[PDB]
């Protein structure tokens, strides 16, 4: 399960998730799983999808995870009123804008990479597309 | 432990912008450090406040090898 | 300069304060009020800010 090893600060303002993605190209492998949607990926969703695609390629080839869940998410428990300080950190998300290449793969035939990515995509809360490496 | 504290805003910043006619003594900029340095006809106070040493027009300029900000007073 | 005619075309109700200030600057009083003004860039600046609610006849 991915998570920052240490952080300058514990908690972070909600913020917004406007704009288009940076890192929209297959830069390490031969194939990629690109986000078409906008949303948050939790560390558990990222791991769930990583496990699915790894089992699929029978632990042959190489996998890259282009996303990192560095955003701390707080939550107020049940029977707790409003105020009295910001809630406690429970999980970590990665903000996802349309275009982000989430995962990359190489060392496997296109057909297999396509299936592995089909299996991982089902564990994600946002719409994805299969992408291939390009000459510029 | 608990948060909840903050200090009073110190009302710092530029008091007289470029071109403004000032009488000698008028504070041009209240700042924490020397974000702006005193140029010609401009004095520097103990709290790094820049003030007019002569009547005239406020002039902002970038001078020197360190590309620093300077406030000067041009005669009008 | 030459004279132009400006007419308020929409209501000032709900308009930004600056836009109401501009309509006062043109002397436009009510919807449909046509007014004769000198075609200078200052008058043309005012016309531009409140363009959506005035019609110009040159």
């Amino acid at each position: 399960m991915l998570q920052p090893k240490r952080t300058k600060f514990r908690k972070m303002h909600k913020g917004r998730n406007r704009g288009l993605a940076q890192g929209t190209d297959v830069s390490f492998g031969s194939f990629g799983l690109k986000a078409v949607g906008r949303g948050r990926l939790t560390a558990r969703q990222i791991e769930a999808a990583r496990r699915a695609m790894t089992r699929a390629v029978k632990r042959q080839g190489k996998i890259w995870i282009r996303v990192f869940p560095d955003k701390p998410i707080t939550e107020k428990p049940l029977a707790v009123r409003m105020g009295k300080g910001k809630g406690n950190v429970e999980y970590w998300v990665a903000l996802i804008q349309p275009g982000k290449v989430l995962y990359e793969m190489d060392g496997v035939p296109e057909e297999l990479a396509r299936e592995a990515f089909k299996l991982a995509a089902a564990k994600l809360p946002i719409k994805t597309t299969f992408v291939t490496k390009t000459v510029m | 432990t608990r948060n909840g504290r903050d200090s009073e805003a110190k009302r710092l910043g530029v008091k007289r912008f470029g071109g403004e006619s000032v009488l000698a003594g008028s504070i041009i900029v209240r700042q924490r450090g020397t974000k702006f340095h005193a140029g010609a006809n401009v004095g520097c106070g103990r709290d790094h406040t820049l003030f007019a040493k002569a009547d005239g027009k406020v002039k902002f300029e970038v001078k020197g090898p360190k590309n620093r900000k300077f406030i000067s007073i041009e005669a009008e | 300069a030459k004279t132009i005619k400006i007419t308020q075309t929409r209501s000032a109700i709900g308009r930004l304060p600056k836009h109401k200030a501009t309509l006062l600057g043109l002397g436009l009083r009510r919807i449909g009020h046509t007014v004769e003004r000198e075609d200078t860039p200052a008058i043309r600046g005012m016309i531009n800010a409140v363009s959506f609610m005035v019609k110009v006849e040159e």
């Binding site: 993605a21 929209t24 078409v36 349309p98 275009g99 597309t129 000459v135 510029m136 | - | -």
Partner: protein
Amino acid sequence: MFTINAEVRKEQGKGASRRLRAANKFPAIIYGGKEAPLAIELDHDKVMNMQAKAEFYSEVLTIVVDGKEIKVKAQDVQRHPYKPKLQHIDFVRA
């Protein structure tokens, strides 16, 4: 030999470029040499099927701008964030 047909852009900017893409066309630039850069428009479908071939990025292409022929090389490509579309192409005079 890749032959691309193009028209000169009668307009420039955000508004005008977005209007081309809605009209199944896309802006592109030709620069390099002593010559002034030429702002051009391309048919999306045509260039899209061409760039599918690896040779497009290596070979010298000919751009036909109002009769005139211009030998160029694909310098840079701005692709759509997630769709299989082209946003803009940089062509350098060869």
